[PDB]
Amino acid sequence: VRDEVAEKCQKLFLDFLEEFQSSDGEIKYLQLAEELIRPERNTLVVSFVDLEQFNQQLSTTIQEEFYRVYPYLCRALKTFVKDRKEIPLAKDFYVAFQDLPTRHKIRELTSSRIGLLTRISGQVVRTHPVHPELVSGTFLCLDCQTVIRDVEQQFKYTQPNICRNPVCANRRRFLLDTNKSRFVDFQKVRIQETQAELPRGSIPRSLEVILRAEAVESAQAGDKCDFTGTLIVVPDARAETNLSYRLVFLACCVAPTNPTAESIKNQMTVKEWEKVFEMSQDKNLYHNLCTSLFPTIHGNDEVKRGVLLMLFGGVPKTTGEGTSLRGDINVCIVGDPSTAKSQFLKHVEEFSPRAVYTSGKASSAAGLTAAVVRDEESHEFVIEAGALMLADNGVCCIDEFDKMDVRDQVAIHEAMEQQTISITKAGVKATLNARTSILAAANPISGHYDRSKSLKQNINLSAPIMSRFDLFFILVDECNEVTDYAIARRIVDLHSRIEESIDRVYSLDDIRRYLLFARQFKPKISKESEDFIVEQYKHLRQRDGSGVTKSSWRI
Amino acid sequence: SDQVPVGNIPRSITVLVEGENTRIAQPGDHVSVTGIFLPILLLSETYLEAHRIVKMLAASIAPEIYGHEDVKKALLLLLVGGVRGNINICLMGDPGVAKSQLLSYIDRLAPRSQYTTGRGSSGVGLTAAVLRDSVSGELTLEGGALVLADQGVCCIDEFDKMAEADRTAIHEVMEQQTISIAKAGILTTLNA
């Protein structure tokens, strides 16, 4: 029996690999496969738009018959690389595709798309440890001593149905030779439906993805990534001699949904580097960014500058005695109701790529820190990350900070101080790093700020957590007619012109790129800066004299 | 409670219903059942198979109590009811004027009636709760005193001593005649 379609696909794909001429006249894939000599490389990346310009028939056949054709494409690639270079026969090879011009929602993955080539988007929730997995094992018969090789395991431990010797007909006595077997890398990941695809009154759906070989490396927890692959049924009506199933997604490539100073410089293109250089040589960068991130908000430039300084962050250091010095900055805001207090947190949500936001009692103790659960296919254990861990090296926003329970506040204080989360549960002891920066919003006890009382008497916050915050901002609503007029003008202008009332200088992508580039720098402290800081601190301490009215916060 | 011996607790029995005898018995009813006593498989467990199930001026309410001539027509009108046409009555009094006996008489006279003394039937005693099933093995909702007293008369003694939640539930029953429950695992509207 012959598989005609598979043979034609093999021929066409080999011809495409051998013949595809690039824009410069050479062949990209020959040079790319020249790097497959290294034992650490097994997958070759092939673009789909280039295939669209070579053979539409082959493209349609591959798209509509991906699962049936893929092993034959792997065999063709193996033959090509074996012909082009001296490689040991034990090595295997795989193909990947990236540029699919269409996307499908998670809820749109019906049973009619089983075995077809699709591209989806999602958010990583959990990852499992790397494992080996069988591909085609070899079985030895215990009766007639006949060796049976190349039996497909699919997705279950399947022994040979019957001995290939007609006289033997053995079906229940076999031995597995692990030495001569065939292995491949295997990892399991969980993904979640994004908020933008949620219908009315619905909870986001969860899906399982499996990564093989090099694709195992990527897809870390907390990311927002696009996956390319197929939909394949895995067992979990009855059969008889003359059935429970579930859906599992196999992915080929994982990409960012919206995409070491020398490495960053090399990665960036010429135009991106030109834009970065243009930004770097502007003093108005200190002012323009304030207008860039908060266009609609009127006034409150101090809060904007504090938020920018918190976003940029400092340089952490370690001492010779074994102690550690904080390098992150935490900011707290307190103000009268409706004084634009919650808008900054939402702006940080929208701007920052790694940000987690919580409010009041909606987050439990297990919601923060982390959790430990079992591995489904081994004796190991896996850790589910909390809000703080997902915001590692990022910004964590907490609204209604006063409503949080005392235990939760103690946990937050521990995370701020030690910058480490220790878990000793279910026979598992572990320590994890949480280098986060906290932006918090709070309200007065009486609902309005008392001008005649100190800061400590106005907020129901414990002294330890109070002392850890670097900057405190206080907002008071002034009963001034001009301020009300100015606020009304901006609100009505925003409502009148939905999108035409914004004149940003730099796009958010450029700001993100510049922040990523700038956070790598580790500036030093000059000698004269030491004396300047000493004198300025002396003046600041002298400000605390008794010859002036009492201040709301001591130094 | 009359047949319970001294210092003991009432015992329970299980009855199976099949055929046209189904849909006759309801919770809270006093019934008489004629049946067969059979075991289930050398110890064994027993059960009952039902064959027959049966249910067990005019202002002369509680003649045992002297006086209160004008306090008895109101009870009769409460029992008769209006044409929502429901009626609610509260009696406030100094101790020793025997308010409890009138409530007990009203409870005994009414066909569907429930009587509450205080915190002994608070919270879960009213409203409803979710419990496992004997047959299906799943969760079902069982109502409280208010649910059982649907289309009947309920009597409450020592009303001022009840908890805030119970008082709010009673107010909701009085004004809206339906109870709304929305907690973890429960989302229901009960008719009372």
Place this chain on the structure above:
Amino acid sequence: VIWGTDVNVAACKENFQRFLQRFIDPLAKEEENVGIDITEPLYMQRLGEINVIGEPFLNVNCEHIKSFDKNLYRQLISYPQEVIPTFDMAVNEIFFDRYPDSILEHQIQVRPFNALKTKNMRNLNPEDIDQLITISGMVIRTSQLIPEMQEAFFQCQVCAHTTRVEMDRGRIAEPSVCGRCHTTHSMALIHNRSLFSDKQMIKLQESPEDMPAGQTPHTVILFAHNDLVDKVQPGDRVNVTGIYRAVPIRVNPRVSNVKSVYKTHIDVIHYRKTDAKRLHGLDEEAEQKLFSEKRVELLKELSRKPDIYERLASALAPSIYEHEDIKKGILLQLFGGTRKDFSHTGRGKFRAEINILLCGDPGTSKSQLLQYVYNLVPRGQYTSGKGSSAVGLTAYVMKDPETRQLVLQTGALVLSDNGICCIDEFDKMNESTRSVLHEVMEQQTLSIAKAGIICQLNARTSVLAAANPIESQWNPKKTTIENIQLPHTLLSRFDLIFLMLDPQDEAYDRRLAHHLVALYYLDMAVLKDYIAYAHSTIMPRLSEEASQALIEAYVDMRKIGSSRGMVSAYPRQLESLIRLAEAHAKVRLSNKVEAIDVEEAKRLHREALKQSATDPRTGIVDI
């Protein structure tokens, strides 16, 4: 047909073929027969519309079949499994006879509906097993898609031949011998080369509203197949037409012994959304078949009259005396504001809905208004005082009924998405419960972060709250803020606050008594159509004059509220005004917001709080 049945295939086929061409109803009106000539046969026109559009599904009413004849209706109800394929093949034959060269994806299927409605599920008997049943209920749980095999693919180990087997009677008999090499037990099943179909499990909560004494609500399980998957959402009130099934239960998975008591089960074949009492849903608003041109012209002519606004306020609730301002506010909430998009700005979601609070003595009809709103508006929810917990709303953790999927389960607020949530006895609610409302009333989103769960949910809900004074009486000596005892942050999020007081007027008492005694002894469909057309067609926009008017109104409100004792004003209140103005723009069917809408919104805001009668410098109201 199988033994035990009196159904004849040929007779039923001929009867259905004749019925599809002969049925004409004179009582049918243009109010529901949209785009169909009543003088001509109805189902033939439906088939023609199917041919024009290409939809492979046809809807047939059971009442029409019963009107044509009773034998066919009885046979269809008794034995749907044999009757339905006959109808399908007859329809396919007629369609292919009348319309050659048509292009579709598969043969036309027929879906019956509006069978005799069973009053209560618990009244059913084993005699009704495998019969057509119609139910009315609300969806609370929908599971994920499940694949079910239909064909099986087998491959040989030695010769590798391709064979296919079709499922029969729910069981697949795998061949024990090959077809080319004749080797025994040489065939292996391949799952990925097979064919699968979608299956979904849904949960319904039953509420016929005529329950007997002491009967608790019921929960039913439904199974949907093929395209019917994901046609409903949690919180929707739907009518389900389907079949009744009984399935045995195994004693344990690995032992073939089964329990004698069977398990109830229902298969779904048809869904209906329209209700004779409630307003149109969002599903209907995304279609063009709702309104005939005559009704559109009538509504457009009606909208031109100046008093129609007040007329609508007169037609909202005729069973409650006066309260014109409250009815106008309820109508404006029903119309809603413009749903602008601020994704590019980075500000986030903007609330386009109106929240209303009503404060007054217990002897008031606010509860009647809340009940009427709950019964009238679809996707409506009701809560009362301490009966609801903080975890009861939003979502709570519950395991999947079979495995450990950690399935978050929606609450009352989430089920109220794109709907109305009514709260009674708002005073008794604890601070923990109000913490949820603090985020819900503004951000329209809920953030959940518990063990293994981190997610955000949509909570686009408009809230009607009812409250009472401290002592259940409005003490004239105490101020409004003292009487209310609610935090300023919570009160600031309410667009309209209505203070209900008793003026003790003799004429008012006489009118109330006369109306109450007489209780012993506009068309709703027109109102529904007008509301749906206004809500699904027009997106209002505001001009410079409205801008200046709003600025002046905001500064005047701030000056008025600067005095102590009264409810102070905040910039957020300004936004509320805009929303109200937009609502007025929907009343007059105008795409442009004018100064009249701003003036009306200002008047309503002023009259709602009774600021005119209230003493500006003492906070005491005295009419």
Place this chain on the structure above:
DNA sequence: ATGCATGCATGCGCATGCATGC
């Protein structure tokens, strides 16, 4: 004859109700 489902503790995570202490 052998491997597996089930009965019986026990930890885990959670929500809910009753009491009290500032």
Place this chain on the structure above:
DNA sequence: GCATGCATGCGCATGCATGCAT
């Protein structure tokens, strides 16, 4: 007037022991 300490039900998973259906 409310958050918290102290039981207690609920739902679940996990580990240790054993008893026999295919």
